[PDB]
Structures are given as structure tokens and as C-alpha cells.
């Protein structure tokens, strides 16, 4: 796996309501997280190229978040 299943489990388990977790669930997340990271970095990069900069910076991620609906849950994590 790209990302460690134990850390994924760890994150899932911080939620007080989570009980047992099927062993497939971290596996689904490892792949799903990849796809999320790819898609958010690519939308962030559109902003980076728009400013004709070559560095992806935090402000690009902030920008990508506002521009797509499925990312509302991230507006407090990265404001501006």
C-alpha cells in the first residue's frame, strides 16, 4: 500500500463512535486517499499555473477548496 493501514485505522478510531473495523476498510481508504490527494493536488496546481508560479503553495490548496463543492468540509482546515 501507498499509505500505512495502521495509521489509517488509527485515524478512523479517533472517532468515538467507531467500534470494530473490517480489514478491508483501511484498504479501501489507502486507495481512496490516493485518489483524493491526486485530485486535490491537481486542482491546487491549476491555481499555481494560473498565477504562473512553479511551486504548489498552501494558498493554492485553499483556492482549490472553495472552487469545488465536494470540498466544503475542508474550508475551515484551509481558509483564505
Amino acid at each position: 500500500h501507498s499509505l500505512p493501514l495502521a495509521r489509517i485505522k488509527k485515524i478512523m478510531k479517533a472517532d468515538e463512535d467507531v467500534r470494530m473495523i473490517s480489514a478491508e476498510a483501511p484498504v479501501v481508504f489507502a486507495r481512496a486517499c490516493e485518489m483524493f490527494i491526486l485530485e486535490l493536488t491537481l486542482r491546487s496546481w491549476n491555481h499555481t499555473e494560473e498565477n504562473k508560479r512553479r511551486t504548489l503553495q498552501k494558498n493554492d490548496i485553499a483556492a482549490a477548496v472553495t472552487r469545488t463543492d465536494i470540498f466544503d468540509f475542508l474550508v475551515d482546515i484551509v481558509p483564505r
Binding site: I21, E24, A32, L38
Partner: protein
């Protein structure tokens, strides 16, 4: 701060770069930020799946529950690719 509760930066960063042109740079700040966004994705999706397990008096989050939650929160574009991945894992 504490990187115990986040996915490791070296895995996240290496994932960011493959999406990007070879000349791209990424701030250390962005790496760290993407670390937090992806960790929030897990919690967000897990919350929804846990809520549905709770409504159904079930105690285990299965793979299907994550996929169902992804669709509910608008990530349906991920769900078919994920099913295919999950089959390659089960076979």
C-alpha cells in the same frame, strides 16, 4: 505538532508529486496542509459510515459502508474505481 494522527508526510508528498509536472515544486507548507486535508477526508468519510452503522445497529464498518458513505458525501466518481480495486484485493 503531533504527526501521530496524520498520515506520514513522506507518503503524502510522494503522492502529490506524481500528479504534478516534473518541474513542479511543493512548499513544505503545502505538504503539511495536504497531510491535514487527507486525514480529514478519512474522518469525514468515517463519520458518515459510522452513522449508518449506528442507524442499523451494526458494530463493524465494512468496505461497503465506506463506499456507500463516499457516494452520500459526493465522491461517487471514486466509487466504481474503488470497487474494481477491492475485487483485485479479494481475488
Amino acid at each position: 505538532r503531533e504527526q501521530d494522527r496524520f498520515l506520514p508526510i513522506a507518503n503524502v508528498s510522494r503522492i502529490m508529486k506524481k500528479a504534478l509536472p516534473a518541474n513542479a515544486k511543493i512548499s513544505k507548507d503545502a505538504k503539511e496542509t495536504m497531510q491535514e486535508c487527507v486525514s480529514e477526508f478519512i474522518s469525514f468519510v468515517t463519520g458518515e459510515a459510522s452513522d449508518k452503522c449506528q442507524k442499523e445497529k451494526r458494530k463493524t464498518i465494512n468496505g461497503d459502508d465506506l463506499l456507500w458513505a463516499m457516494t452520500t458525501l459526493g465522491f461517487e466518481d471514486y466509487v466504481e474505481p474503488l470497487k474494481v480495486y477491492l475485487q483485485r484485493f479479494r481475488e
